[PDB]
Symmetry: D2
Subunit: 126 residues, 4 copies
């Protein structure tokens, strides 16, 4: 319902729907920075651990000296909507942006922002 | 080459435009067949945070860049050109088989080398 | 308190304490199979995503046609005790062994077996 | 060579001793300086599940094998020898710089090749 939430979802959705359907690049992500910017990116699939969209976003933000990221979401291609961050993404997000929130779907399938720590209970502290 | 220098210059500007960091310490820049340039910075993590080159691949994909023809990585602390790691070579060989990577030759001078030459008898993923 | 729990912890602990102190190999893991076997392994640290001990254990079990794994634990070197599985390990465990439990420490720092799904709420379904 | 054939034979027996699987489809066997042989099977996962070779590295480390001198990977479906992937070459070059890998030559016959030759102008991690 949030304007910030709807906008992030919109940017990620528009990003994935603007590229050709691909099995290598099938998810887009968008994150909001505390200094007033939004960074996007798409995943790179590879058996050796190609980065999820969220990790591409982290590198894109870093390249712009974005600093602290407060919220991030991932949207799947072919109108799949919000995709929950995988376990590796949660670990990287927790270690590099502990104050970040991730948008996921609740029981009713409605968008909801959750603290990263809640997505990774008793998380490993690197 | 003009295109070569262009990527080196862009990646160098990128890493020199962000705070010194152990998490974000390398920048990369790639050239697409259409002539566009894409950049990115690595995201270090023990679970396999993406190298700058992989962030670049995802950034280009988010822009529907298509095929990439050349890519280089520049390290912080004035280290200069860094040869692509083994994982990067595999991902590049699988997603952009015709791409070339810039590395330092015997005399420490930059040069463009085909991906296949950097991964002889390479494993071809199906 | 469980005998099965104490034994897994013991096997993992004995495994890590039997090798030279290393920054590359610093954690051991042990998992129980439904067919009556216990598999161990140590991590392999690498920036490209060297496998955590638990992933080495998964490959070791697979090599023995172990089948279904029911419980797994990780023990750090230098008497660090039980280490919670990282986010990537949780994702791999969920996708390859959905019925498995992981031993982690509770508020009182006491060993406790938890369902993998509880360690990865609203988990991404590959 | 006798040692060569030994690794090939061991890895072949390993992959042929487990159920056909898309998650566990390659076996690897390595030789240590002391003469011991270590095996393992890959663990496929998009977040970067370990290749069989990395599982082998962790298995050897759990036995305090020390330095590894040679390693090979054998694929299921009677595919035979598989060249080590780019990520594997990087990890091998960083943790076992003097190791050699068995690959198929021009005539498709097995041969031992130094890791450095498989990763020319390789990135050296610090
Ligand atoms: C044959 N092949 C493989 C196809 C394979 N089915 C692709 C696949 O499953 N990709 C997925 C891998 C990562 C990605 N993903 C998942 C969770 C996330 N929210 O953290 N962020 C993210 O980017 O989601 C993709 C997704 O749902 O299409 C090739 N690409 N060649
Ligand atoms: C303590 N710590 C770790 C510090 C560690 N020394 C960082 C490090 O070595 N990072 C490296 C990881 C990836 C990156 N790299 C390497 C090869 C490449 N050309 O493919 N592309 C690429 O981006 O190069 C970085 C580099 O040389 O500083 C933390 N960040 N917390
Ligand atoms: C300089 N350097 C890096 C040193 C670095 N500090 C090592 C490090 O942090 N390793 C960690 C990486 C993975 C491992 N780990 C974590 C969570 C797990 N339960 O899922 N399973 C697992 O094996 O835990 C190790 C641990 O706690 O020592 C080198 N190795 N060269
Ligand atoms: C649908 N799916 C994916 C199926 C996929 N085709 C599996 C696949 O290609 N796996 C490969 C991933 C790693 C492995 N591999 C590659 C190079 C190596 N020499 O370094 N060592 C190694 O173990 O080789 C396997 C291989 O050739 O079957 C699932 N498992 N769910
Ligand atoms: As939000
Ligand atoms: As070039
Ligand atoms: As248990
Ligand atoms: As050999
Ligand atoms: Zn992810
Ligand atoms: Zn790399
Ligand atoms: Zn892990
Ligand atoms: Zn590999």
């Amino acid at each position: 319902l949030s304007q910030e939430e709807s906008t992030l979802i919109e940017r990620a959705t528009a990003t994935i729907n603007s590229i050709p359907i691909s099995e290598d690049y099938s998810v887009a992500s968008a994150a909001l920075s505390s200094d007033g910017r939004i960074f996007t990116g798409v995943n790179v699939y590879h058996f050796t651990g190609g980065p999820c969209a969220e990790l591409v976003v982290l590198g894109t933000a870093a390249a712009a000296a974005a600093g602290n990221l407060t919220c991030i979401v991932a949207i799947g291609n072919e109108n799949r909507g919000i995709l929950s961050p995988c376990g590796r993404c949660r670990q990287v997000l927790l270690d590099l942006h502990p104050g970040i929130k991730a948008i996921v779907k609740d029981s009713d399938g409605q968008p909801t922002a959750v603290g990263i720590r809640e997505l990774l209970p008793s998380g490993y502290v690197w």
